[PDB]
Structure 1
Amino acid sequence: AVPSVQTFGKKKSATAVAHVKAGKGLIKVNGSPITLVEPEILRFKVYEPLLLVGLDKFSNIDIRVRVTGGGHVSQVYAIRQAIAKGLVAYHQKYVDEQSKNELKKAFTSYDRTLLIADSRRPEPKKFGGKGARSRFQKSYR
C-alpha cells in the first residue's frame, strides 16, 4: 500500500480536495501545474506555502488538487490551504511529529489561514434592503 492521504481546503464556497502521495515531488491542480493558476499575483499567493516551508519538504510528494466552487480568489485560497494542510497531514502520518509540529508552527507564524478555514460566512439578506444590513432609502418629503 503506497502512503497516501486525502485532505481539503475551503473558502467562502471554494472546495479544493487534495490527494497527497509519495511521488517525485510535483504539485498539480486540475491536471495543471501550480505555476499556471494565472492571476500572476495570487499565483505567488499560492506559492506562499511551498516557498515559506522550503521546497526540500516536497522532495518526494506529489499533490493533486481538484477545485470546485467560488470565484478565482476563493479558489486560490482554498488551493493554498489544501496543499498546506495536505503536507501537514502527510508529515503527521509518516514524518516525525516534531517535524510536523515545527512545520505547522512556521505555517501558523506566517499566516493563520493556511491550516484553519475561514469563519466569515455570508450574512443572509433581509427584506427591506438590497443587502444584509443596507436598507433601501428613507424618504419623508
Structure 2
Amino acid sequence: AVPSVQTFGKKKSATAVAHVKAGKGLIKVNGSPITLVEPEILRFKVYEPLLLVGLDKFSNIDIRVRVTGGGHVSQVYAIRQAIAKGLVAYHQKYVDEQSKNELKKAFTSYDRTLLIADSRRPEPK
C-alpha cells in the first residue's frame, strides 16, 4: 500500500511501539504533539534523536508512538529508543545501507542506548 514500518523499544517495563510512514513531518505521542512531553526536564532527552541527526531527515515521514506501561521516567527512555530504531529501519528498506550506516554512526557516537537495551533485570530472589 504505502511505505511503512513498525519498531519497538524497551527500558524496564515500558514498551513503546512506533509506526513510520511517508507523509509530512509530524511527531505525535498518544496523539499529542511531542513538544508537550512531560516532565519538562526530561523533554530535551527526547529531542536528542532529532537534533543529533538534523530535522531535514524527518520532513517526509510521519511518526506516531504509544508507550503503554512502566513509570514516568522509564517510559521516556523507551520512546526515544523506539524513534531512533524506527528511523534506521525506514532507511534500510527505502534508501540504502550507506545512509543507514550514516545514521547508525551518529547515534552510536553519542549513546549506545539509542539502539540496544541495557538488559538490566531485577534480582531473581
TM over 0.5: yes
State the partner residue of 1:74: 74
Looking at structure 2, the residues matched to 88 and 94 of structure 1 have their Cα atoms a distance apart, in angstroms, of: 10
Looking at structure 2, the residues matched to 72 and 100 of structure 1 have their Cα atoms a distance apart, in angstroms, of: 31
State the partner residue of 1:102: 102
Partner of 2:86: helix, strand, or coil?
helix
Looking at structure 1, the residues matched to 105 and 8 of structure 2 have their Cα atoms a distance apart, in angstroms, of: 19
Native 8 Å contact 1:12 1:118 kept in 2: no
Higher relative contact order by CA 8 Å / sep ≥ 6: 1 or 2? 2
* Gap runs ≥5 in structure 2: none
The number of residues matched between the two structures is 125
Computed over aligned residues only, the root mean square deviation of the Cα atoms, in angstroms, reads 2.6
Q: Which portions of structure 1, spanning 4 or more consecutive aligned residues, are displaced by more than 2 angstroms?
A: none
Higher-Rg structure is: 1
- TM-score w.r.t. structure 2 length? 0.96
Q: CA deviation at 1:93?
A: 0.9
Deviations 1:11-61 (A, max 9, x none): 100000001111101111111111111211211001111110100110111
- TM-score w.r.t. structure 1 length? 0.85
* Gap runs ≥5 in structure 1: 125-140
Partner of 2:67: helix, strand, or coil?
strand
